[PDB]
Paper text:
We thought that proteins with alpha helices at both their N- and C-termini might be fused to generate artificial repeat proteins by connecting the C-terminal helix of the repeating unit to the N-terminal helix of the next repeating unit. To test this design strategy, we used a protein A domain as the repeating module and generated 3-, 4- and 5-module repeat proteins. All these repeat proteins were successfully produced in E. coli and could be crystallized. In the crystal structures, all the repeating units were connected as designed. The twist and bending angles of the fused helices were very similar to those of the ideal helix. Interestingly, the protein A modules in the crystal structures, especially the last ones, exhibited significant structural variation, and close structural analysis demonstrated that this structural diversity was due not to the helix fusion but to the intrinsic flexibility of the protein A module.
Here, we propose a method for generating proteins and protein complexes with complicated shapes using fusions of alpha helices. To design amino acid sequences that can stabilize the alpha helical structure of the fusion sites, we superimposed one or two turns of terminal alpha helices of connecting proteins using a molecular graphics program. Then, the amino acid residues important for forming a fused helical structure were chosen from the two natural sequences in the superimposed region. Our method does not require complicated computer calculations for the design process and can be used for the assembly of artificial protein complexes with predictable and rigid structures.
Author numbering: 36 to 177
Write the structure that this text describes.
Protein backbone atom coordinates (compact mmCIF):
# COMPACT_ATOMS: atom_id res chain seq x y z
CA UNK A 1 0.00 0.00 0.00
CA UNK A 2 1.08 3.63 -0.36
CA UNK A 3 -0.25 4.69 3.03
CA UNK A 4 1.65 1.71 4.46
CA UNK A 5 4.89 3.00 2.95
CA UNK A 6 4.53 6.61 4.11
CA UNK A 7 3.55 5.47 7.61
CA UNK A 8 6.38 2.92 7.72
CA UNK A 9 9.01 5.48 6.74
CA UNK A 10 7.56 8.19 9.01
CA UNK A 11 7.55 5.89 12.05
CA UNK A 12 11.07 4.86 11.04
CA UNK A 13 12.38 8.44 11.13
CA UNK A 14 10.79 9.80 14.34
CA UNK A 15 13.80 11.16 16.27
CA UNK A 16 12.67 10.94 19.91
CA UNK A 17 11.55 7.32 20.19
CA UNK A 18 13.65 4.62 21.79
CA UNK A 19 14.26 1.47 19.76
CA UNK A 20 11.69 -0.67 21.57
CA UNK A 21 8.81 1.78 21.05
CA UNK A 22 9.67 2.26 17.37
CA UNK A 23 9.93 -1.51 16.82
CA UNK A 24 6.61 -2.01 18.62
CA UNK A 25 4.82 0.49 16.38
CA UNK A 26 6.42 -1.07 13.30
CA UNK A 27 5.51 -4.59 14.42
CA UNK A 28 1.92 -3.43 14.92
CA UNK A 29 2.08 -2.14 11.34
CA UNK A 30 3.25 -5.55 10.15
CA UNK A 31 0.45 -7.16 12.16
CA UNK A 32 -2.46 -5.11 10.76
CA UNK A 33 -1.40 -2.55 8.13
CA UNK A 34 -4.98 -1.23 7.89
CA UNK A 35 -4.32 0.55 11.21
CA UNK A 36 -1.58 2.74 9.66
CA UNK A 37 -3.20 6.15 10.19
CA UNK A 38 -3.90 5.24 13.82
CA UNK A 39 -0.45 3.79 14.53
CA UNK A 40 1.26 6.76 12.91
CA UNK A 41 -0.96 9.23 14.76
CA UNK A 42 -0.23 7.97 18.26
CA UNK A 43 3.41 7.42 17.29
CA UNK A 44 3.62 11.10 16.37
CA UNK A 45 1.77 11.84 19.61
CA UNK A 46 4.34 9.77 21.47
CA UNK A 47 7.17 11.62 19.72
CA UNK A 48 5.87 15.17 20.28
CA UNK A 49 5.46 14.31 23.96
CA UNK A 50 8.86 12.73 24.62
CA UNK A 51 10.65 15.55 22.82
CA UNK A 52 8.87 17.86 25.25
CA UNK A 53 10.04 15.80 28.24
CA UNK A 54 13.60 16.34 27.03
CA UNK A 55 13.40 20.08 26.40
CA UNK A 56 11.92 21.00 29.78
CA UNK A 57 14.31 18.48 31.32
CA UNK A 58 17.21 20.51 29.88
CA UNK A 59 15.91 23.96 30.90
CA UNK A 60 18.86 24.94 33.11
CA UNK A 61 17.21 27.78 35.06
CA UNK A 62 14.52 25.65 36.74
CA UNK A 63 14.94 23.45 39.79
CA UNK A 64 13.99 19.78 39.87
CA UNK A 65 10.64 20.56 41.52
CA UNK A 66 9.53 22.94 38.78
CA UNK A 67 10.83 20.66 36.02
CA UNK A 68 9.12 17.48 37.16
CA UNK A 69 5.97 19.47 37.97
CA UNK A 70 5.92 20.40 34.28
CA UNK A 71 6.72 16.78 33.40
CA UNK A 72 3.88 15.42 35.51
CA UNK A 73 1.52 18.02 34.05
CA UNK A 74 2.66 16.81 30.62
CA UNK A 75 1.81 13.22 31.60
CA UNK A 76 -1.64 14.01 33.07
CA UNK A 77 -2.44 15.86 29.84
CA UNK A 78 -0.42 15.17 26.67
CA UNK A 79 -2.58 17.26 24.35
CA UNK A 80 -1.64 20.67 25.85
CA UNK A 81 2.06 19.81 25.38
CA UNK A 82 2.59 22.74 22.99
CA UNK A 83 1.31 25.05 25.73
CA UNK A 84 3.10 23.46 28.69
CA UNK A 85 6.45 23.64 26.91
CA UNK A 86 5.99 27.28 25.86
CA UNK A 87 5.11 28.53 29.32
CA UNK A 88 8.00 26.56 30.77
CA UNK A 89 10.52 28.28 28.51
CA UNK A 90 8.91 31.59 29.44
CA UNK A 91 9.53 30.73 33.08
CA UNK A 92 13.14 29.76 32.36
CA UNK A 93 14.05 33.12 30.80
CA UNK A 94 12.17 34.95 33.55
CA UNK A 95 14.06 33.18 36.33
CA UNK A 96 17.34 33.36 34.40
CA UNK A 97 17.21 37.12 33.84
CA UNK A 98 16.39 37.73 37.51
CA UNK A 99 19.38 35.66 38.61
CA UNK A 100 21.84 36.95 36.03
CA UNK A 101 20.86 40.60 36.53
CA UNK A 102 21.68 40.01 40.20
CA UNK A 103 24.81 37.81 40.09
CA UNK A 104 26.47 39.57 37.06
CA UNK A 105 29.86 41.16 37.81
CA UNK A 106 30.37 44.28 35.71
CA UNK A 107 27.12 46.25 36.11
CA UNK A 108 26.82 49.26 38.37
CA UNK A 109 23.94 49.39 40.81
CA UNK A 110 22.07 52.04 38.81
CA UNK A 111 21.92 49.74 35.79
CA UNK A 112 21.22 46.76 38.06
CA UNK A 113 18.31 48.48 39.84
CA UNK A 114 16.93 49.69 36.51
CA UNK A 115 17.00 46.14 35.12
CA UNK A 116 15.39 44.60 38.21
CA UNK A 117 12.62 47.20 38.03
CA UNK A 118 12.04 46.88 34.28
CA UNK A 119 11.98 43.12 34.84
CA UNK A 120 9.43 43.37 37.67
CA UNK A 121 7.24 45.59 35.48
CA UNK A 122 7.03 43.35 32.39
CA UNK A 123 8.51 39.84 32.19
CA UNK A 124 7.66 39.57 28.48
CA UNK A 125 10.93 41.38 27.71
CA UNK A 126 12.79 38.99 30.04
CA UNK A 127 14.74 37.48 27.15
CA UNK A 128 15.47 41.00 25.89
CA UNK A 129 16.48 42.44 29.26
CA UNK A 130 18.73 39.47 30.03
CA UNK A 131 20.31 39.84 26.59
CA UNK A 132 20.64 43.61 27.06
CA UNK A 133 22.26 42.93 30.43
CA UNK A 134 24.79 40.38 29.18
CA UNK A 135 26.01 42.70 26.42
CA UNK A 136 26.27 45.54 28.93
CA UNK A 137 28.18 43.34 31.39
CA UNK A 138 30.61 42.39 28.63
CA UNK A 139 30.98 45.94 27.32
CA UNK A 140 31.95 47.11 30.83
CA UNK A 141 34.31 44.19 31.45
CA UNK A 142 37.88 44.71 32.77
Amino acid sequence: NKEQQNAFYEILHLPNLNEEQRNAFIQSLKDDPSQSANLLAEAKKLNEQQAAFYEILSLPNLNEEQRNAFIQSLKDDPSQSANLLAEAKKLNEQQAAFYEILHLPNLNEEQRNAFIQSLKDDPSQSANLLAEAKKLNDAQAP
